Amino acid sequence: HGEGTFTSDLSKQMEEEXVRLYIQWLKEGGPSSGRPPPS
Questions:
Q1: Which segments within the chain are labelled E, that is strand?
Q2: Sign of dihedral through CA atoms 8, 9, 13, 19?
Q3: CA separation for the pair 10, 21 (Å, rounded)
Q4: 3-state class (DSSP) for residue 18
Q5: Distance CA 20, CA 28 (A)
Q6: Alpha-carbon distance 4 to 36, whole Å?
C-alpha cells in the first residue's frame, strides 16, 4: 500500500549512486572508521 509520497529515484537513481557512496562509506569500514551510514 502507498500514500503517494515523493520518492522513487532514490533507490535506483539516487541509491544507484547511494550504493557507490554507501559502499564508499564501507570502502573505509563505515561502521568502524568514524561516520554513520548514508541513505
A1: none
A2: negative
A3: 13
A4: helix
A5: 13
A6: 29
Three cell numbers written together for 4: 503517494
* Ramachandran angles phi, psi of 23, nearest 5°: -65, -30
Residues in the chain: 39
Measuring CA to CA, which residue among 17, 20, 19, 22 is closest to residue 36? Answer: 22
Element (H, E) at 17: helix 15-27
CA distance 20 to 1: 29
Experimental method: NMR
DSSP-derived secondary structure letter, 14 = S
SS3 2: coil
